[PDB]
Amino acid sequence: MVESIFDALAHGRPLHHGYWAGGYREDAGATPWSDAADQLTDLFIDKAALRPGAHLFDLGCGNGQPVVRAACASGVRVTGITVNAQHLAAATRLANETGLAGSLEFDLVDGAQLPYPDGFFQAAWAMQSVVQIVDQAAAIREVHRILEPGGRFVLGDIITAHTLNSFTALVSEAGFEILEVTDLTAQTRCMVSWYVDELLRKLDELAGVEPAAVGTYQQRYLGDIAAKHGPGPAQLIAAVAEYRKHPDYARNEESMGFMLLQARKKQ
Ligand SMILES: Nc1ncnc2c1ncn2[C@@H]1O[C@H](CSCC[C@H](N)C(=O)O)[C@@H](O)[C@H]1O
Secondary structure, eight states, rough: OOOOOOHHHHTTTTSOEEEEEEEEHHTTTSHHHHHHHHHHHHHHHHSOOOTOOEEEEEEEOTTSSSHHHHHHHHHOEEEEEOOOHHHHHHHHHHHHHTTTTOOOOEHHHHTSSSSSSSTEEEEEEEESOOGSSSOHHHHHHHHHEEEEEEEEEEEEEOOOOOOHHHHHHHHHHTOOOEEEEEEEEGGGGGGGHHHHHHHHHHHHHHHTGGGHHHHHHHHHHHHHHHHHOOOOHHHHHHHHHHHHHHHHGGGTTHHHHHHEEEEEEOO
């Protein structure tokens, strides 16, 4: 078994952005990514299927962690899909390990053509799947087909493939009623961007004290990551650290961002 090094570093916690309500730099890292990603999940929970017993279609299911947090908290039945064979496994295994094997089922399926009948689910999700789906139009017309009339559908993903305007076009052009759209760039971060941010934070703090210690502390911090998550992730973060040590990088940071779109199907 060999996992993508992103999956390897996430190490079972979720594959989406961290959501820090009221700003990431504002929070100055008193709240970690590991928790903020769960905050973002709770955010899709709040805004779609608030309802227990209801049924939720998860489009990119990934790890399966966020699905399971929603089926506990809100008491919902879940059907997620993925094309990544190793994601399907992590999610199914996790489902069995929680006693939730009976409500929420995972199936490896291309999201452009869905086996489910029309008007089945009460809600739908796409957490950072749609950018990496190839036929997005088809995928989303399909998801429109899948929901009950009135069912909410909550998408969020990375922006500048697409932009806030272009996503809103994509989703209305499949029939949906768009009732909310938001640029969360201020309030969200990448998993990796966060690990690197902590590293360089504490390194610049240490640097104003004993600069001669910096290399050592860096080596130690990478050590601790290597200890929890395995060496691949440590070697990763080390490299991203080396690249933000160059300012020809500087303005490339915020040239990507995040958005959240809340839609409903008409009654
Ligand atoms: N065409 C497609 N149909 C269904 N899933 C797809 C897909 N293209 C990509 N995906 C899936 O979308 C997922 C994106 S990673 C996002 C995971 C999840 N929302 C979480 O928060 O943990 C991956 O599991 C990938 O296999």
